[PDB]
Design a protein around this ligand. Sequence first.
Ligand SMILES: *[C@@H]1O[C@H](CO)[C@@H](O[C@@H]2O[C@H](CO)[C@@H](O[C@@H]3O[C@H](CO)[C@@H](O)[C@H](O)[C@@H]3O)[C@H](O)[C@H]2NC(C)=O)[C@H](O)[C@H]1NC(C)=O
Ligand SMILES: *[C@@H]1O[C@H](CO)[C@@H](O)[C@H](O)[C@H]1NC(C)=O
Ligand SMILES: [Ca+2]
Ligand SMILES: [Ca+2]
Ligand SMILES: [Ca+2]
Ligand SMILES: [Ca+2]
Ligand SMILES: [Ca+2]
Ligand SMILES: [Ca+2]
Ligand SMILES: [Mg+2]
Lengths: 602, 56, 506
Amino acid sequence: LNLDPVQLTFYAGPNGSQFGFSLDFHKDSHGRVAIVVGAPRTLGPSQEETGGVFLCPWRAEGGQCPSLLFDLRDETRNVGSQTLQTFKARQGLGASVVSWSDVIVACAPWQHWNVLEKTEEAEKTPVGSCFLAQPESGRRAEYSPCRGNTLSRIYVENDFSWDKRYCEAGFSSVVTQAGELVLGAPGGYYFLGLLAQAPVADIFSSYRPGILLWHVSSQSLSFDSSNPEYFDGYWGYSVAVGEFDGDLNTTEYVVGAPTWSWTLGAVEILDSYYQRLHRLRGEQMASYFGHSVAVTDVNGDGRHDLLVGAPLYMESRADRKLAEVGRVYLFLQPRGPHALGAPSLLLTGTQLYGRFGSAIAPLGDLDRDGYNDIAVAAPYGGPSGRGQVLVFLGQSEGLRSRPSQVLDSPFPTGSAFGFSLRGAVDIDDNGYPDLIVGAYGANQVAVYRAQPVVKASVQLLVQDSLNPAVKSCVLPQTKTPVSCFNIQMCVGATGHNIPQKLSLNAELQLDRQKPRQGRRVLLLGSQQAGTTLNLDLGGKHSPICHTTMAFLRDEADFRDKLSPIVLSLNVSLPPTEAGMAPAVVLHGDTHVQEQTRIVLDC
Amino acid sequence: LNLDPVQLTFYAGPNGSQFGFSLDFHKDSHGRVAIVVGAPRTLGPSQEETGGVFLC
Amino acid sequence: GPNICTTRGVSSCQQCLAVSPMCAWCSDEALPLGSPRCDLKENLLKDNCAPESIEFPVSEARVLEDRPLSDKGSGDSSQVTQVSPQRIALRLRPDDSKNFSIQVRQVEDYPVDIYYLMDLSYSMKDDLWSIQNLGTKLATQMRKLTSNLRIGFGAFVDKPVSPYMYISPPEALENPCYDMKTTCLPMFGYKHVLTLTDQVTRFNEEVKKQSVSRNRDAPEGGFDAIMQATVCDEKIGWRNDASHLLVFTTDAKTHIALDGRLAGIVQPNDGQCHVGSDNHYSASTTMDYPSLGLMTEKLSQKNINLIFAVTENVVNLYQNYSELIPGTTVGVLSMDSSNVLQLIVDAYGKIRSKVELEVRDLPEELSLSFNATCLNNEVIPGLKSCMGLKIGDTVSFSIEAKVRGCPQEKEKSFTIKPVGFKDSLIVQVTFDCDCACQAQAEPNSHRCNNGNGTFECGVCRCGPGWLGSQCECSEEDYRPSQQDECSPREGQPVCSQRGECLCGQC
Ligand SMILES: *[C@@H]1O[C@H](CO)[C@@H](O[C@@H]2O[C@H](CO)[C@@H](O[C@@H]3O[C@H](CO)[C@@H](O)[C@H](O)[C@@H]3O)[C@H](O)[C@H]2NC(C)=O)[C@H](O)[C@H]1NC(C)=O
Ligand SMILES: *[C@@H]1O[C@H](CO)[C@@H](O)[C@H](O)[C@H]1NC(C)=O
Ligand SMILES: [Ca+2]
Ligand SMILES: [Ca+2]
Ligand SMILES: [Ca+2]
Ligand SMILES: [Ca+2]
Ligand SMILES: [Ca+2]
Ligand SMILES: [Ca+2]
Ligand SMILES: [Mg+2]
């Protein structure tokens, strides 16, 4: 709604580095906000795609950023008989960056790991590895919950039970408020998928540089299931946290399984013990219902609400039987928590193959009205297909079914503008949350600042119905007497961080239904039924209302004595296009109509 | 609590005093505010005991 | 009577005709009372104004190019026509609807292109042993139903990338079934084995030279193979004259789009032919799987019927895929594919047993309604597809176009086409919104105050500057009291003392 599309911040990475694949906001100790940007194909020291994370400090012009120096180096440690190896080649360091408190968790899901025991081995499979860092102190740590030393033949002997070799842990990383890092490993348990949750403090306090296979004592992992539905579910493709069971002591995870039950797709809400509280099935197969999941209270009722994304939803148009556009589901949590059922809103994209719903970012309260707003990104939507982001405002019932604002890609085609979204953080500290969109195709990140929202109010008062010729105050510049009265319109402009130069424009139209220059009611001065005048409110808590004397034409002169006398009061921003970009957004009621009639014997 | 004492607005009146017996904020319809002060012992039509009001 | 054209204001050829197709414009410079110019044709013809100078376009749909439906496509497949007519010119005024009919006949013996897409996963090794002599028996059975059969072959396992392909020890990169002591061949995404050709001996020879590979996860990179086979005309060698068949043989699930992110592959699949000179999919490792929507679009664009010859363990799944892609059907392959010949024959019969219309590049303004007339004279409205047909049968479809508003292009062409066939009807719709007299504008009409009014269509367009009857009202509205007031013979009070007599309202 109020996200500025004219002045953008462009943060660049290395060429072909996928700079922008994932991003988050890191809050420096001093309250200074920085952006953590994953670049999962940055060149390593040995001229090879390894990964990387950049810590972009906030600026106005933007540009290049410094990078967090992690340990990009294959590791080999022989624990007696065995020989543990970690291969950091095309590991994808930066595919999931999440900042909590003062720590940054940057996960490489495709880091490979092998256990060479004599002739045998455990197979060089991708287990993933999250790298935790504290850029203000240098404390580095690593977390690889799925590393194992079990030989390959053992799984074959036991039907691949509890096989965590292909986890790619860190595919989707979240951090709860209590400081617990939760990682979704879609490929764990032989591509069933699992969740690996562990306190960040324990991760930092159980890591020793040189030891490759250790065990965090407080970590918890999901349960392997023999139910045929979960097979190839990719359960952990997207993960989010929220309150969904009542008690605020317990925190619940929302986990997406985009291919649950034969590509049908599902989203599971379950407590910390991984007991499935509720399951939200998909609607159309191969739609990837669960690709993105977000938790926010859009309707403001105090209960968290769920947003699911199916970027490959093929809508049933009248002309096109099945067109791939994408679809975002909104589920509203009612009282009686185990009753969340049918979807409450079904947003759908427009462009074909635009993948509407690839990223659902809770924006906070962008408009500052007491309801939560979200952003849904279609990385290949838009008429030219270069990428779009649609801002949806929250309301009492669900949220707005139309995009309040639409942001288009400033980058060439194929930039994947919108693949990564992150918001609800006031980057410039102007009282309004900003938004960061990552186009990894162009290796860049666009930062949108939310300009202030001026909430207007209009009150146009016409005292009563009047007689054609009361023979009161004379017609202007003449002794000829006419009927006269007063028109008073009070316009107010209330908002946060409004500048001191705010000057609205009041269009006062006298009986707009009739054609101008001969209206039934004119002004007692210039006689112009339509008067648009500037009214300045640059820091005025008191609405300003310049009363005007208005003249009424003779009973014989005006022949339509039965048509209602409807005055129009319109409020518009001044032509700020002459200077720089419009510094304010005039959201709210800015146009009203007031009707009266013709009275007799008065 | 935050009323500035070190800087004040001083409005003069008639030498016959009473300027400040009663006063109020005249709120203009346009939104402006001006201070209206009644001086109930100003001069009369001919040096008579009367009142009188100023608009500051 | 009412003449809704007469009300709602009168502007020019555009407005009166845009109000309703039934409305007519009597541009002839007759009496203004005798030529209101915004009324129905029947009302206007009574009050003259029609020396063939009236404007009233009539919607028409002329058959520009029609040939009779063939009955046996044994010879000269290029000269075989299955859709009558082949090209029509349709004319529509704004907010008008008009219908026509098409006849679709599936010829008796049409040429057939069968391309065998084989899942070369290890569990499908036994199947490979029941396919060695498939060419000869397939030709023998198909010759009863065609005379220009051409068979091809392609193989697929999955993307040769880490999460699906074993990458340790390095011996497994050249024998992914080393540990089970057998010998397999390196993992391949999709390789085009045999180009479509009539010599079934070539098909039986290329088979027995194929070996299975080994993949980790149950889902197979199948839809990538379907996309590459479909979009590669030059390599696969599709004939744009034959019934394209694409038999899909598999036993497990399939990798839908967005799964390639499990391997670091995030670039979306584009419908391009990447099969290089080596007959190997050269972008399998650097391009995501195709989605159902893109696969369906490329199937329709190249006129390919899809047969999921899938084993009993996945049939329901692929059945649920069949009801997402037009022109596809699912057959129950066996564990060793011991009946794929019968499956292909019956699937081809069922595919020829249904005709479904498809609309291509239809302008958004046009809205179509379909009435299908199948065997006998029964006509089912609404639906655009009737089943139950056989080989040689003829069906008809009554199709109504319905434009809303008026596109500025005034001439757009769209396609009506039965699914799978190349035969198509090209409809060139011309929007007759404006008229000749509107184009014949005279802004300098001396009759209209020395030419300050566009005499376009008898009436004069002058706007608020001269909105009077003779383009004489120098100021907008009746305030200036345009010259020659309502006062009869002039010199009369306010239109005969009737106050504001408002032109003809006195
Ligand atoms: C192929 O599609 C059909 C049609 O949708 C599937 O059959 C139906 O699948 C739905 C799943 O949404 C079943 O509904 C659910 O059933 C479970 C019990 O299994 C119940 O607990 C849920 O509340 C919900 O009602 C429906 O019963 C089922 N009906 C039939 C006749 O099969 C089929 O499963 C799909 N096959 C696949 C995806 O392999
Ligand atoms: C939540 O935890 C607090 C701990 O102070 C406890 O007092 C409260 O009863 C708990 N609420 C529950 C378990 O519903
Ligand atoms: Ca809870
Ligand atoms: Ca809620
Ligand atoms: Ca809001
Ligand atoms: Ca801000
Ligand atoms: Ca088999
Ligand atoms: Ca593969
Ligand atoms: Mg298989």
